[PDB]
Enzyme design. Structure first.
Site, PDB file in Angstrom:
ATOM      1  N   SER A   1       0.806  -1.214   0.000  1.00  0.00           N
ATOM      2  CA  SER A   1       0.000   0.000   0.000  1.00  0.00           C
ATOM      3  C   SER A   1       0.842   1.269   0.000  1.00  0.00           C
ATOM      4  O   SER A   1       0.278   2.368  -0.018  1.00  0.00           O
ATOM      5  CB  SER A   1      -0.938   0.009   1.209  1.00  0.00           C
ATOM      6  OG  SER A   1      -0.208   0.114   2.419  1.00  0.00           O
TER       7      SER A   1
ATOM      8  N   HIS B   1       4.485   2.116   9.070  1.00  0.00           N
ATOM      9  CA  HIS B   1       3.395   2.935   8.554  1.00  0.00           C
ATOM     10  C   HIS B   1       3.804   4.396   8.696  1.00  0.00           C
ATOM     11  O   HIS B   1       4.969   4.711   8.943  1.00  0.00           O
ATOM     12  CB  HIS B   1       2.079   2.651   9.289  1.00  0.00           C
ATOM     13  CG  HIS B   1       1.484   1.313   8.984  1.00  0.00           C
ATOM     14  ND1 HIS B   1       1.528   0.261   9.873  1.00  0.00           N
ATOM     15  CD2 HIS B   1       0.855   0.846   7.881  1.00  0.00           C
ATOM     16  CE1 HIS B   1       0.940  -0.791   9.335  1.00  0.00           C
ATOM     17  NE2 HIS B   1       0.527  -0.465   8.124  1.00  0.00           N
TER      18      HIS B   1
ATOM     19  N   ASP C   1      -4.564   1.443  10.889  1.00  0.00           N
ATOM     20  CA  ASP C   1      -3.676   0.308  11.138  1.00  0.00           C
ATOM     21  C   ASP C   1      -4.340  -0.599  12.169  1.00  0.00           C
ATOM     22  O   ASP C   1      -4.028  -0.580  13.363  1.00  0.00           O
ATOM     23  CB  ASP C   1      -2.309   0.792  11.604  1.00  0.00           C
ATOM     24  CG  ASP C   1      -1.575   1.568  10.534  1.00  0.00           C
ATOM     25  OD1 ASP C   1      -1.793   1.292   9.336  1.00  0.00           O
ATOM     26  OD2 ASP C   1      -0.785   2.465  10.893  1.00  0.00           O
TER      27      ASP C   1
END
Ligand SMILES: *[C@@H]1O[C@H](CO)[C@@H](O[C@@H]2O[C@H](CO)[C@@H](O[C@@H]3O[C@H](CO[C@H]4O[C@H](CO)[C@@H](O)[C@H](O)[C@@H]4O)[C@@H](O)[C@H](O[C@H]4O[C@H](CO)[C@@H](O)[C@H](O)[C@@H]4O)[C@@H]3O)[C@H](O)[C@H]2NC(C)=O)[C@H](O)[C@H]1NC(C)=O
Lengths: 179, 148, 86, 174
Positions: free
Chosen positions: B44, B84, B110
């Site tokens: 992603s 992230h 998340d």
């Protein structure tokens, strides 16, 4: 057989060109230690519907942010930069000693897409979430534009551009009428 | 007994494996926390950060945490180091840090760490902050790790 | 005797100073390709030209490395003094 | 293809003709010092590895940093030890029956061949304890003229150097 000489030569020249490209790449990322900032100019501000969202999860506060942006990027492009990234530093303080910040939006900016970044009245789909609903009673919120880039193989610095907008806020009013 | 072959065997074998493992340990020590040098595998993040990259790692040597930064942490449901981006900060000047997190190119948080009422990242559930990345050796090391 | 001359019977039966000057030419063309690579990267102001010059220099080094140099193999003693026959 | 093949084959042939003709007892001990440093390095390396495997990291940082700095300076003194004592000297031999005599007149020997050059050098010296003085014989030659790719590295083509060695030993030991 007799290709062991060519094998030793290919190991030698392969490690030679690998060492050469590594010396070249950290001499490349070595001399660019200095960075340049950007400029921010916001004309007006609009602030509406700051409501106390009594929810089953928490009893928090919800609000919307709408403003304008005018900026320039004709002095920010480099030789090893790949990606330009945005994040909005919107810092404020509450009554329970909680220094909060909410980001607004970002763009996947590639070198050559847009020569001038100026647009009015955008709407951010990210929910401006208040933590412990202490924004109702705040006297200032400030905004300062910052950015982040990635080099080819180097380090990750963050350089915040100079320029801030300070907007007050009323005491107790739900659907805020701003001009 | 076996003088020469055992001599050169323990010499080169112990030299190579001890030197490699303890320069790895020296990087572990010099990065402050544990902090191994890692490789990226996210999907992603590909319009923002491509596949197969080495990442170094800095830590909490006289610096607090900020916003607009990659944060790598544990996934305890799979026990995997996953990085992230940070999106929200919420602090108090007495010694507890609870805040939200959300990656790039997603409208999804998340998930998997805590419930909806609690914040996602505690100050002890973190690995650190990566300063640098190498964009060519990562494909080689993930193809080496995918080989039996 | 003859029970140990099997595998250790291959030294370099070739020239020395010819390969010295040859490796000097190899390092010279590598450094020349490298310096024109980063000055053309400084002029043209993008990295793909530097990548292409480095890959072209590596390909030229391979095309000058792989060939046998049969004349050198035919005459190792062209520069080296002539060895005798056993 | 490299020179190290004819280097260590000629060193093995020199030790073979030494043990076959001169009858002296070869010894060592710098190799035993290498055993000492490598076994001690592996000792505290495996101890630090097991101690880091059995214990968490932030309570194990500082003395592990001290151990890796100690290993770094130990490898530095090992490197200067190698570059100051073990340049090219490869063998030491002692004599038989020193009945009433001091253990002196001992020879070291070295073979020099630099990076990709046709100049072999054989340098052997000895400490003679009569005046506590060293004498060194040197050979600046090349061996690869007469033989061919079949590898005729025989004693029957290299015996005049050993003849010079033993009659020089005869005229120096009287
Ligand atoms: C808007 O609301 C704020 C607070 O609610 C009021 O306070 C001033 O805010 C400005 C910024 O908006 C401050 O200026 C900057 O202060 C930084 C440190 O202050 C922080 O901590 C205090 C603690 O109370 C907060 O109030 C404050 O908002 C900040 O969070 C400095 O680090 C800054 O320095 C930067 O610039 C210099 C160059 O000038 C660099 O050299 C530095 O490295 C650094 O980058 C900056 O000085 C200001 O200090 C705050 N206080 C006062 C007394 O002015 C505002 O008054 C309010 N404004 C309006 C119009 O209502």
């Amino acid at each position: 057989n007799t290709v062991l000489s060519r094998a030793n030569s290919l190991f030698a020249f392969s490690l030679s060109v690998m060492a050469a490209l590594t010396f070249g790449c950290f001499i490349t990322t070595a001399f660019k230690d200095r960075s340049v900032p950007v400029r921010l100019h916001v004309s007006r501000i609009m602030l509406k519907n700051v409501e106390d969202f009594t929810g089953p999860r928490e009893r928090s506060d919800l609000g919307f942010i709408t403003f304008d942006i005018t900026a320039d990027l004709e002095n920010i492009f480099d030789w090893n930069v790949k990606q330009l990234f945005l994040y909005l530093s919107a810092e404020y303080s509450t009554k329970n000693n909680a220094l909060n910040q909410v980001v607004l939006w970002d763009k996947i900016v590639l070198r050559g897409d847009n020569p001038k970044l100026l647009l009015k009245d955008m709407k951010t789909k990210y929910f401006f979430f208040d933590d412990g609903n202490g924004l109702k009673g705040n006297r200032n919120v400030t905004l300062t534009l910052s950015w982040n880039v990635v080099p080819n193989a180097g380090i990750l610095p963050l350089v915040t551009g100079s320029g801030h907008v300070s907007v007050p806020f009323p005491d107790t009013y739900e659907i805020t009428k701003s001009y | 007994m076996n003088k020469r072959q055992l001599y050169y065997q323990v010499l080169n074998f112990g030299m190579i494996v001890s030197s490699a493992l303890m320069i790895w340990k020296g990087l572990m020590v010099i990065t402050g926390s544990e902090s191994p040098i890692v490789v990226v595998l996210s999907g992603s993040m590909e319009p923002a950060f491509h596949r197969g990259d080495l990442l170094f790692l800095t830590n909490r040597v006289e610096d607090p945490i900020r916003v607009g930064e990659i944060v790598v942490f544990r996934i305890e449901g799979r026990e995997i180091p996953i990085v992230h981006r940070v999106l929200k900060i919420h602090e108090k000047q007495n010694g507890h840090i609870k805040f939200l997190t959300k990656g790039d190119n997603n409208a999804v948080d998340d998930r998997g760490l805590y419930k909806q009422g609690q914040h996602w990242l505690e100050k002890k559930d973190v690995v650190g902050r990566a300063r640098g990345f190498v964009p060519y050796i990562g494909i080689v090391t993930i193809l080496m790790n995918d080989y039996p | 005797p003859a029970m140990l001359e099997h595998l250790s019977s291959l030294p370099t039966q070739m020239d020395y100073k010819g390969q010295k000057l040859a490796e000097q030419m190899f390092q010279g063309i590598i450094l020349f390709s490298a310096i024109v690579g980063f000055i053309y990267g400084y002029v043209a102001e993008q990295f793909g030209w530097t990548v292409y010059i480095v890959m072209a220099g590596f390909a030229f080094s391979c095309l000058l490395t792989l060939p046998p140099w049969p004349i050198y193999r035919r005459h190792p003693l062209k520069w080296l003094p002539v060895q005798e026959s056993s | 293809w490299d020179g190290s093949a004819v280097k260590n084959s000629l060193d093995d042939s020199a030790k073979k003709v030494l043990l076959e003709k001169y009858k002296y007892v070869e010894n060592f001990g710098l190799i035993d010092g290498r055993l000492t440093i490598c076994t001690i390095s592996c000792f505290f390396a495996i101890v630090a590895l097991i101690w880091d495997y059995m214990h968490p990291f932030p309570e194990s940082k500082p003395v592990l940093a001290l151990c890796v700095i100690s290993y770094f300076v130990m490898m530095g003194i090992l490197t200067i030890y190698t570059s100051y004592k073990e340049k090219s000297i490869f063998l030491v031999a002692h004599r038989k029956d020193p009945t009433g005599m001091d253990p002196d007149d001992i020879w070291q020997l070295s073979s020099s061949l630099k990076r990709f050059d046709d100049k072999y050098t054989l340098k052997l010296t000895f400490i003679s304890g009569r005046t506590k003085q060293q004498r060194e014989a040197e050979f600046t030659k090349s061996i690869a003229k007469f033989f061919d790719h079949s590898g005729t590295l025989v004693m029957d083509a290299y015996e005049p150097e050993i003849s010079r060695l033993h009659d020089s030993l005869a005229i120096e030991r009287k």
